[PDB]
Design a protein around this ligand. Structure first.
Ligand code: O1J
Length: 297
């Protein structure tokens, strides 16, 4: 059981050690398309590349490349697209991907500016009456509504294919107090946010995969997918002992490198799953408590 593994590693202070063994066991696959010279300005970081086997391809003949990976968790029947924060020049590619993959939700785990630097382009409209047109990909995006909580925001966007005049409603879930290379306040507000995404239908098999991003799409994004998948597997098995977090993480790392970027993100992941297990095992009331301790009011 993970709760006892947690106490062992915590008492022995072995997190940096567990983390390094995950690093050493992690898959390595070619990322040849990412490293082509014509794709240099489509990557936010030179050392974070999608693997060729799991990369999302854009449906445009010129250049199909985006820094995005499909994570497919077969047993949990969950799939996620993990991507970098879009660049000024890839905002159009980002929304094209959302359109082509039939995603219903975008989960953003960073602020546009962190530590006095830009982590992401402003890729959605700030005001209802000021819509965004992406000329390169022939898409229009309108802000429909915005609901602000203390530490996260939920926006209703309308995405229109200008080529075909079809429109879709996209939900933008913006977690607004998660530091880069860091961990949420307590897992409470984290979990509260995760259960909000689930409640929306965005993670449901009726829709294309949810798009998840932070700055590089591996750290904070990794922590989101790892907690969701572990809780689901727990749910499907009704057995907290049967879930090995370290094995699930290594499976996900077959699809995108570097998921979980620090030993404290690994520790937080355990803490999020352990706390979340209360709910999965039948204490439905624990969800009301999370809203309270989150102070989302
Ligand atoms: O904490 C995160 O979610 C992402 O980490 C930033 C990063 C890590 C490695 C390489 C480039 C950027």
């Amino acid at each position: 059981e993970m709760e006892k593994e947690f106490e062992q590693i915590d008492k022995s202070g072995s997190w940096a050690a567990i983390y390094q063994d995950i690093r050493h066991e992690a898959s390595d696959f070619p990322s040849r398309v990412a490293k082509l010279p014509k794709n240099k300005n489509r990557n936010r970081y030179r050392d974070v590349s999608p693997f060729d086997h799991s990369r999302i391809k854009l449906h445009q003949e010129d250049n199909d490349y985006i820094n995005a990976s499909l994570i497919k968790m077969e047993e949990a029947q969950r799939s996620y697209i993990l991507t970098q924060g879009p660049l000024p020049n890839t905002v159009g590619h980002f929304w094209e991907m959302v359109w082509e993959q039939k995603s219903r939700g975008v989960v953003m785990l960073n602020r546009v500016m962190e530590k006095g630097s830009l982590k992401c382009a402003q890729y959605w409209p700030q005001k209802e009456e000021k819509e965004m047109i992406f000329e390169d990909t022939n898409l229009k995006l309108t802000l429909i509504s915005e609901d602000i909580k203390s530490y996260y925001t939920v926006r209703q966007l309308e995405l229109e294919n200008l080529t075909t005049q079809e429109t879709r409603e996209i939900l933008h879930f913006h977690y607004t107090t998660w530091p880069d290379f860091g961990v949420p306040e307590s897992p409470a507000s984290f979990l509260n946010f995760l259960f909000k995404v689930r409640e929306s239908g965005s993670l449901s098999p009726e829709h294309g995969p949810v798009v998840v991003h932070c700055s590089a799409g591996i750290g904070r994004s990794g922590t989101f997918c790892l907690a969701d998948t572990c809780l689901l597997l727990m749910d499907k098995r009704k057995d907290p002992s049967s879930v090995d977090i370290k094995k699930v993480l290594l499976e996900m790392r077959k699809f995108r490198m570097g998921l979980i970027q620090t030993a404290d993100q690994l520790r937080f992941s355990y803490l999020a799953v352990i706390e979340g297990a209360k709910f999965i095992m039948g204490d439905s009331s624990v969800q009301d408590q999370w809203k309270e301790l989150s102070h989302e009011d």
